[PDB]
RNA sequence: GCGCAAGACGGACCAGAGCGAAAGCAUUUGCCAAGAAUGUUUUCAUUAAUCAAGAACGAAAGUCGGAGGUUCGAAGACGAUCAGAUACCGUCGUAGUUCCGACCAUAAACGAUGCCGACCGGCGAUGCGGCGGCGUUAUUCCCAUGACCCGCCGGGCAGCUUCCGGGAAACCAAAGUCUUUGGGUUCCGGGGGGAGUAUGGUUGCAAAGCUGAAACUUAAAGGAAUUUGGCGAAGGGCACCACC
RNA sequence: GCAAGACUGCUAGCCGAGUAGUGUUGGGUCGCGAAAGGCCUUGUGGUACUGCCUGAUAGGGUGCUUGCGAGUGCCCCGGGAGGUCUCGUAGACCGUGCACC
């Protein structure tokens, strides 16, 4: 069906908001590769930007055939 | 796609593709300088040495032929030289 | 080959394996390796040692095939030749 | 693709665009002509002589450090054989194929490759006859192997 | 017209393959065209394994299996309902059906 | 046979589909109270609900299809 | 159950894998010989995939002279089945099926698609060779090696998708780049029979292969594809005038 | 000669000592690895586990609990309390035919 009172029962849930902005965290998990990607473009190493420790010795693409 | 700047390519595609289909004809091989740690002199050898090679004076064997490049003796220093 | 009374004395004559185990060993997407040597012991016993070999897929392997080259099989077979020559 | 094979193949040398004696090379033309003469006194075919001089002396190629190529200077010195090395290797292969062939009569593909290789040496011999290399009265048959090897 | 992309077999760069005799039939069907059955089964059926288990001298004795390969001609395969027919677009499916039982 | 085996009684958990040539016998998942963990699939004839219990003579055989 | 003897074949490992011009090729080991592809700042310098004459190889079956003849098995014998079998079925069963040489050159020898060269999409795997790059293993340290992983290159057997484009459509990375027609080069077909027939030539011990008509008759013979229709085809649904 | 950074092996006081002995594919300058006898600060804190074999609390191979799957648990020793561990469901075949139209 279609709604004209825009479904108040979750419209008021949309009016409900967390106090935190859900993206302005105290720290953000950033890989070094995207860090040096953003480093050459406009902004260097910021306080909110941290270096991910390398846990990449094991690879991807689990076997299918 | 259709539109590529064939006149002035980025260097990664002519170090990417095969040598015969580059924009200009350029080989992927080079000349190499190798010396023995027990000896003193520096000889000049190809990247694909193609045979057994011995330095003058008969000190040691430098490298062995292999179907790809040459497999060098361990401990020997090397410098990528260009003209 | 030796009885005197109410007893039978035995001797080793040959070793085999069950058909179910060797049928469980043979599977697709792997290489089967066979190697036999006619060997002699210090006494006058002439033996014949049949062995089988089956390749192992790696735990991080993505390939389903998991085969080997022919000269690798020949080298493994020659290793089996010298092992069963040495130990008997 | 190939001439007696149905497989396309792309594997050949590609000389660089640069036409210059390299600066790090400290060798002139007369001395390198002297070790070409010495390796000719050793008595080998010009192809392996060229690859070993390139390999063990570090020169790019001979044709840019002297005015001409090595077959020209061997025929100038006169030590070069009259019979070319291509027909030499091919008729050595033909002698080896027939020497394998007469002991094993039931060998069909060896006979097939044999017919292919006298076809090859005939097609090369016509070109060397029309290029005024071989004499026009030169002939080939299967029974001539002691005179030319 | 042409029914399938291949010809009911797996001959691409050979031109000749070794034929193998059928099991139910005796046809000289080739290896790539015939349907092959590799069945996994125990020595006995499922409604007697317990009756074997109390009749055993050993304790917790594992029941062995039988590992055989069946070579089926296509007429014997369709007669024994091993393989069925599909539609036009339904034949464009290489994957086997899921084994649930 | 010829073994004096005791009578084990069982309690129902879930009703499933019914098999048979004419479709009369019902496959039922059922389980014992003296050993709760082990459960068995049995063939039962007649109308069966959920919540009742069943009397059983043999705990040895396994249920199967119409034949 | 224990041995001996003979002959045949190399299963499972064995794949839309590899090799070979094609037929075709599977137990290990040794000997000989050839070749693709990969790499090359090596050599020769136009030496060319194109081919009537001509030449080699060539599935099975068929013929000729030798020892072997396990198994299977054309003709033949017997018994059932059937209204009627010298057919389907079962038991014996000659020649062949096996080897050496001497033949013939016929297959649905089919990718039912000649050879070379160039151009025009992507994707994920496979095989070879080369190349670069975290990590693990032949136990713990260091290097090359084999194994595994992530990427690239060339050749090959192949797969998925499409308004690139084409076709009558099945379908096509070729069967496209074709009226907006022309890259080079062999063989081959003008409705259907008659008929690959008669004659002649040709080769073959034979069996027979190649070349190859005419008279007369016919307005159809055919290719792709849609809808009830019919299966001694499969799958599913319903029915106390079907069942439990 | 000067400059301070970054990383790591080993030990938990140190010599003996990485001597012996062990093995690997090919090596190396080498992995595993104590002791006898000793001299002296007279011998670092927190932190979880642990099925079996091989070869390290790694790696590899391979199990038990209820048929299956998910939890939970499975080193040694000493005491106490319990005794039917929890949760959900296919775990289906397994005697069966077939002349002649």
Swiss-Prot record, chain B:
Pfam families: Ribosomal_S27e. Its cofactor is Zn(2+). A zinc finger (C4-type) spans 36-58. Binds 1 zinc ion per subunit. The keyword Electron transport does not apply. GO terms for biological process: ribosomal small subunit biogenesis; rRNA processing; translation. Residues 1-22 are annotated as: Disordered. SUPFAM superfamilies: Zn-binding ribosomal proteins. Zn(2+) binds at residues 36, 39, 55, 58. It is found in: Cytoplasm; Nucleus, Nucleolus. Keywords: Cytoplasm, Metal-binding, Nucleus, Phosphoprotein, Ribonucleoprotein, Ribosomal protein, Zinc, Zinc-finger. The modification Phosphoserine is found at residue 10. GO terms for molecular function: structural constituent of ribosome; zinc ion binding. One of its GO terms (cellular component) is cytosolic small ribosomal subunit. Component of the small ribosomal subunit. Part of the small subunit (SSU) processome, composed of more than 70 proteins and the RNA chaperone small nucleolar RNA (snoRNA) U3. Belongs to the eukaryotic ribosomal protein eS27 family. PANTHER family: 40S RIBOSOMAL PROTEIN S27 (PTHR11594). Component of the small ribosomal subunit. The ribosome is a large ribonucleoprotein complex responsible for the synthesis of proteins in the cell. Required for proper rRNA processing and maturation of 18S rRNAs. Part of the small subunit (SSU) processome, first precursor of the small eukaryotic ribosomal subunit. This is Small ribosomal subunit protein eS27.
UniProtKB/Swiss-Prot annotation, chain C:
ADP-ribosylated at Tyr-67 by PARP1 in presence of HPF1. The modification ADP-ribosyltyrosine is found at residue 67. It is found in: Cytoplasm; Nucleus; Nucleus, Nucleolus. Component of the small ribosomal subunit. Mature ribosomes consist of a small (40S) and a large (60S) subunit. The 40S subunit contains about 33 different proteins and 1 molecule of RNA (18S). The 60S subunit contains about 49 different proteins and 3 molecules of RNA (28S, 5.8S and 5S). Identified in a IGF2BP1-dependent mRNP granule complex containing untranslated mRNAs. Binds with high affinity to IPO4. Interacts with DDIT3. Part of the small subunit (SSU) processome, composed of more than 70 proteins and the RNA chaperone small nucleolar RNA (snoRNA) U3. Belongs to the eukaryotic ribosomal protein eS1 family. This is Small ribosomal subunit protein eS1. It comes from Oryctolagus cuniculus. The lineage of its organism: Eukaryota, Metazoa, Chordata, Craniata, Vertebrata. The chain holds residues 89 to 176 of 264 of the full protein.
UniProtKB/Swiss-Prot annotation, chain D:
Its main location: cytoplasm. There is a cross-link at residue 42 (Glycyl lysine isopeptide (Lys-Gly) (interchain with G-Cter in SUMO2)). It is found in: Cytoplasm; Nucleus, Nucleolus. There is a cross-link at residue 26 (Glycyl lysine isopeptide (Lys-Gly) (interchain with G-Cter in ubiquitin)). Ubiquitinated at Lys-26 by RNF14 and RNF25 in response to ribosome collisions (ribosome stalling). One of its GO terms (biological process) is translation. InterPro entries: Ribosomal_uS15 (IPR000589), Ribosomal_uS15_arc_euk (IPR023029), Ribosomal_uS15_N (IPR012606), uS15_NS1_RNA-bd_sf (IPR009068). Keywords: Acetylation, Cytoplasm, Isopeptide bond, Nucleus, Phosphoprotein, Ribonucleoprotein, Ribosomal protein, Ubl conjugation. SMART domains: Ribosomal_S13_N (SM01386), Ribosomal_S15 (SM01387). The modification Phosphoserine is found at residue 29. The keyword Transmembrane helix does not apply. Signal peptide: none annotated. The keyword Ubl conjugation applies. The modification N6-acetyllysine is found at residue 26. GO terms for cellular component: cytosolic ribosome; cytosolic small ribosomal subunit; nucleolus. One of its GO terms (molecular function) is small ribosomal subunit rRNA binding. The modification Phosphotyrosine is found at residue 37. The modification N6-succinyllysine is found at residues 26, 33. Component of the small ribosomal subunit. The ribosome is a large ribonucleoprotein complex responsible for the synthesis of proteins in the cell. Part of the small subunit (SSU) processome, first precursor of the small eukaryotic ribosomal subunit. During the assembly of the SSU processome in the nucleolus, many ribosome biogenesis factors, an RNA chaperone and ribosomal proteins associate with the nascent pre-rRNA and work in concert to generate RNA folding, modifications, rearrangements and cleavage as well as targeted degradation of pre-ribosomal RNA by the RNA exosome. Belongs to the universal ribosomal protein uS15 family. This is Small ribosomal subunit protein uS15.
Curated annotation (Swiss-Prot), chain E:
The gene is RPS26. Component of the small ribosomal subunit. The ribosome is a large ribonucleoprotein complex responsible for the synthesis of proteins in the cell. Residues 86-96 have a biased composition (Basic and acidic residues). It comes from Oryctolagus cuniculus (Rabbit). Keywords: Cytoplasm, Endoplasmic reticulum, Phosphoprotein, Ribonucleoprotein, Ribosomal protein, Zinc. Zn(2+) binds at residues 22, 25, 73, 76. GO terms for molecular function: mRNA binding; structural constituent of ribosome. Pfam families: Ribosomal_S26e. Belongs to the eukaryotic ribosomal protein eS26 family. This is Small ribosomal subunit protein eS26. GO terms for biological process: translation. GO terms for cellular component: cytosolic ribosome; cytosolic small ribosomal subunit; rough endoplasmic reticulum. The keyword Endoplasmic reticulum applies. The modification Phosphoserine is found at residue 53. The keyword Zinc applies. InterPro entries: Ribosomal_eS26, Ribosomal_eS26_CS, Ribosomal_eS26_sf. It is found in: Cytoplasm, Cytosol; Cytoplasm; Rough endoplasmic reticulum.
């Amino acid at each position: 069906i279609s709604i004209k009172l825009q479904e108040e029962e979750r419209e008021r849930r949309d009016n409900y908001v967390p106090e935190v902005s859900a993206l302005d965290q105290e720290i953000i998990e950033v890989d070094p590769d995207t860090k040096e990607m953003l480093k050459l473009l406009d902004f260097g190493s910021l306080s909110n930007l941290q270096v991910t420790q390398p846990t990449v010795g094991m690879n991807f693409k689990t076997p299918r055939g | 796609p259709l539109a590529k700047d064939l006149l002035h390519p980025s260097p990664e595609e002519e170090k990417r593709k095969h040598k015969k289909k580059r924009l200009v004809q350029s080989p992927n091989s080079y000349f190499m300088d190798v010396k023995c740690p027990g000896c003193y002199k520096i000889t000049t050898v190809f990247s694909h040495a193609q045979t057994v090679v011995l330095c003058v004076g008969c000190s040691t064997v430098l490298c062995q032929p292999t179907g790809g490049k040459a497999r060098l003796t361990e401990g020997c220093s090397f410098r990528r030289k260009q003209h | 080959e030796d009885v005197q009374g109410k007893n039978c004395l035995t001797n080793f004559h040959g070793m085999d394996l069950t058909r179910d185990k060797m049928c469980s060993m043979v599977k697709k997407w792997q290489t089967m390796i066979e190697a036999h040597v006619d060997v002699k012991t210090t006494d006058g016993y002439l033996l014949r040692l049949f062995c089988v070999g089956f390749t192992k897929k790696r735990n991080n392997q993505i390939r389903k095939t998991s085969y080997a080259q022919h000269q690798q099989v020949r080298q493994i077979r020659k290793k089996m030749m010298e092992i069963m020559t040495r130990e008997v | 693709g190939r001439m007696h094979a149905p497989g396309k193949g792309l594997s050949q040398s590609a000389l660089p665009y640069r036409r210059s004696v390299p600066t790090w090379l400290k060798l002139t033309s007369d001395d390198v002509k002297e070790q070409i003469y010495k390796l000719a006194k050793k008595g080998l075919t010009p192809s392996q002589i060229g690859v070993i001089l390139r390999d063990s002396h570090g020169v790019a190629q001979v044709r840019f450090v002297t005015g001409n190529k090595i077959l020209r200077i061997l025929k100038s010195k006169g030590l070069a054989p009259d019979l070319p090395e291509d027909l030499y290797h091919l008729i050595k292969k033909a002698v080896a194929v027939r020497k394998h062939l007469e002991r094993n009569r039931k060998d069909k593909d060896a006979k097939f490759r044999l017919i292919l290789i006298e076809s090859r040496i005939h097609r090369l011999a016509r070109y060397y006859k029309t290029k005024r290399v071989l004499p026009p009265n030169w002939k080939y048959e299967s029974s001539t192997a002691s005179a030319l090897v | 017209t042409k029914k399938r992309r291949n010809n009911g077999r797996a001959k691409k760069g050979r031109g000749h393959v070794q034929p193998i005799r059928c099991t139910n039939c005796a046809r000289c069907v080739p290896k790539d065209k015939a349907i092959k059955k590799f069945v996994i089964r125990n020595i006995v059926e499922a409604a007697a394994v317990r009756d074997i288990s109390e009749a055993s001298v050993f304790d917790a004795y594992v029941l062995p299996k039988l590992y055989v390969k069946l070579h089926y001609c296509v007429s014997c395969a369709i007669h024994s309902k091993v393989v069925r027919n599909r539609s036009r677009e339904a034949r464009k499916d290489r994957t086997p059906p899921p084994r649930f039982r | 046979t010829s073994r004096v085996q005791p009578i084990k009684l069982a309690r129902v958990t879930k009703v499933l589909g019914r098999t048979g040539s004419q479709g009369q016998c019902t496959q039922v998942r059922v389980e014992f109270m003296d050993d709760t963990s082990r459960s068995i699939i049995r063939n039962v004839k007649g109308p069966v609900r959920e919540g009742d219990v069943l009397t059983l003579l043999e705990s040895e055989r396994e249920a199967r299809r119409l034949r």
